[model samples]
Target: QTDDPRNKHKFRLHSYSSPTFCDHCGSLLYGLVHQGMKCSCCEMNVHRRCVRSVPSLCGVDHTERR
Candidate 1:
């Protein structure tokens, strides 16, 4: 299955210039528009900074890795 059910390009960050708050930290997000990937445990999206902080490509970790 895909990360997004309806829109494939919806979450790709660079696709959108508008900044929205991350439901978890309320930090300003820039990149693709996310439809939301809530982790059932903590129910949040990984900080865009956290993911982007990685060495290589960024990703949306959906396991609620809070």
Candidate 2:
């Protein structure tokens, strides 16, 4: 259930909580419907339509400080 790491971002359709924005265009992700997509690796939020123009600065991980 994975792909090449060189692919960088691994965005998937995610039902994100409110107040999130698209890392691609810096726009507020609509709080309605599914909200937005999330990167499995970078863990970044992105708008569904703007994902294509997103930059690949995906070299990071979540800090389990939660």
Candidate 3:
């Protein structure tokens, strides 16, 4: 799926391997969880489904870049 052009460079989904926090909601991820995403730019981790509902900047943007 990373090969897909539509996939944003900042975050890419991958199978959950270990504990990680959902950056969008700040929830802990562990035990029997499925797919999650790892952000390449900021190294933030979040659930695959959760990523969609998150803001485009993932709320990480401090200034009003838009």
Of the candidates shown, which would achieve the greatest lDDT relative to the real structure?
A: 2
Q: Candidate 1, after superposition: displacement of residue 59 in Å?
A: 16
Those runs of model 2 whose alpha carbons end farther than 4 Å from true positions after fitting are 1-6, 16-19, 31-33, 60-66
lDDT, candidate 2, 24-66, per-residue tens: 7788877642766788886887776676676566775447886
**TM-score, model 3 to reference:** 0.51
Once superposed on the true structure, which residue ranges of model 1 sit more than 4 Å away at CA? 1-14, 30-46, 50-66
> Each model's TM-score?
0.27, 0.58, 0.51
RMSD of candidates 1 onward, in order: 9.8, 6.0, 5.9
The model with the greater TM-score, 1 or 2, is 2
Model 1 vs truth, CA RMSD: 9.8
Assess the local accuracy of residue 23 in candidate 3 as a C-alpha lDDT between 0 and 100: 73
Q: What is the lDDT of residue 56 in candidate 2?
A: 62
Which residue pairs in model 3 clash with each other?
none
lDDT, each prediction: 0.42, 0.69, 0.64
Native RMSD of candidate 3 (Å): 5.9
